[PDB]
Amino acid sequence: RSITSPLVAHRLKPIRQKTKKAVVSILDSEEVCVELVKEYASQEYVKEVLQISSDGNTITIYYPNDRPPSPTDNISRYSFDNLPEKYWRKYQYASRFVQLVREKEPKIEYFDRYAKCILMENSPGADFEVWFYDGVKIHKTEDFIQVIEKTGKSYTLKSESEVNSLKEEIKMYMDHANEGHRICLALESIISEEERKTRSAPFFPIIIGRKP
Amino acid sequence: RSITSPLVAHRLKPIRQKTKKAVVSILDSEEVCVELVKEYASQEYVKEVLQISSDGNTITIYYPNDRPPSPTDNISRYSFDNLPEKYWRKYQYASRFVQLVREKEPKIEYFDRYAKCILMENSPGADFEVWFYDGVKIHKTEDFIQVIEKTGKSYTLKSESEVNSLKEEIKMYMDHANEGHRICLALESIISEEERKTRSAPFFPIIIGRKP
């Protein structure tokens, strides 16, 4: 708990990503599995299966001795708080993969007067992309802001301290982009509060308005 | 006002519906024009143009003596409340045209556990269509409820004694549709309440969730 936040894979599209360290996948049930694989002879196979619940709270490990291996009798279960030092690095690897996905998949896609405002799933501090209808793009991250001109020229900035030195050509775009970012954030809280009151379908992702 | 409610053409797609009596169209400015047409020589033309504001409150009529002609000096203006008996019938013609459009264009398109719930623009009492993933359809109007079974059989319900005559197989569907209806209406009110506070682009139409 002291190293990383719980893995949350709510509302993510299913995917099976094969990497050099392990094969990590998001299931249709929103659970995340990491398959530890080892090379042998002319065909590799699975050595250990780590399955993390969609909220990151419950972890099960099994191995019966391109699809998820079936559950077996040789299965152990731990809670997030009671995760051993073994599997510690493995959980974080799965978390990194999930963040890589949450950073790209949108949560609120809002079409305003001048741009397509996209609020990403990787909350808190969720990434926010503003695609202006004129070709200009602003990409807001928690750490930095990327600004791209219509001609393909681009540059990165960092923070509020740079505002009083910003050219008007960008400042007007930014004044709007921050208004759009506020609106998406305001709606997220407003709808999320309504979502929590009803045991029903999720209310995300949402699309507001239509592109012109 | 005692005859019809004001014409409202907010958030509607542009359209030009041509008849042999008049041409009624929705502009990209959300204004609605009715062009009175008469046959002339080898090419028919417009004799009088009536322009209704997007909220139905302001009506202007002009004619200087395939799109609306530019405004002229021979123009008169009325408010909705003091609209003369002359041209009264034309306002109603445009009003019914807009309602036909508002009845079909969606406002909230919500994907729940079992159906695609569509809340239409023709508020108050907006039509609500529930398209179940298994093929069952329930169409709720202010006046009646139409139920279409998965096998193609269909019937309408006009009174409670008929609603309570439904098979339990269908009552389960109707109970679900009513919960979907409540949620869409609750969100419609909640978002509208936020929309009224924000000097920005409209917050409708919206899509909630993704088809499974």
Swiss-Prot record, chains A, B:
Coiled coil regions in record: none
Modification type Phosphoserine: residues: S70
Cellular compartments annotated: Cytoplasm, Cytoskeleton, Microtubule organizing center, Centrosome, Centriole; Nucleus, Nucleolus; Cleavage furrow; Cytoplasm, Cytoskeleton, Microtubule organizing center, Centrosome
Effect recorded for N74R: Does not affect the interaction with TENT5C
Domain Cryptic POLO box 2 (CPB2): 105-212
Induction profile: Down-regulated in HCT 116 colorectal cancer cells, leading to aberrant centrioles composed of disorganized cylindrical microtubules and displaced appendages. Down-regulated by p53/TP53.
Effect of I75P: Decreases substantially the interaction with TENT5C. Does not affect localization to the centrosome. Loss of TENT5C recruitment to the centrosome
Post-translational modification: Acetylation by KAT2A and KAT2B impairs kinase activity by shifting the kinase to an inactive conformation.
Domain Cryptic POLO box 1 (CPB1), first and last residues per copy: 1-104
Protein family membership: Belongs to the protein kinase superfamily. Ser/Thr protein kinase family. CDC5/Polo subfamily.
Related illness: Microcephaly and chorioretinopathy, autosomal recessive, 2: A severe disorder characterized by microcephaly, delayed psychomotor development, growth retardation with dwarfism, and ocular abnormalities.
Assembly and binders: Homodimer. Interacts with CEP152 (via N-terminus). Interacts with CEP78; this interaction may be important for proper PLK4 localization to the centriole and PLK4-induced overduplication of centrioles. Interacts with CEP131. Interacts simultaneously with TENT5C and CEP192. Interacts with TENT5C; this interaction leads to the TENT5C recruitment in the centrosome. Interacts with CEP85; this interaction may be important in cell migration and centriole assembly.
Annotated domain remarks: Cryptic POLO box 1 (CPB1) and Cryptic POLO box 2 (CPB2) domains can simultaneously bind to both TENT5C and CEP192.
Physiological role: Serine/threonine-protein kinase that plays a central role in centriole duplication. Able to trigger procentriole formation on the surface of the parental centriole cylinder, leading to the recruitment of centriole biogenesis proteins such as SASS6, CPAP, CCP110, CEP135 and gamma-tubulin. When overexpressed, it is able to induce centrosome amplification through the simultaneous generation of multiple procentrioles adjoining each parental centriole during S phase. Phosphorylates 'Ser-151' of FBXW5 during the G1/S transition, leading to inhibit FBXW5 ability to ubiquitinate SASS6.
Protein's name according to its UniProt entry: Serine/threonine-protein kinase PLK4
Biological classification of the source: Eukaryota, Metazoa, Chordata, Craniata, Vertebrata
Residues of the full protein shown: 588 to 807 of 970
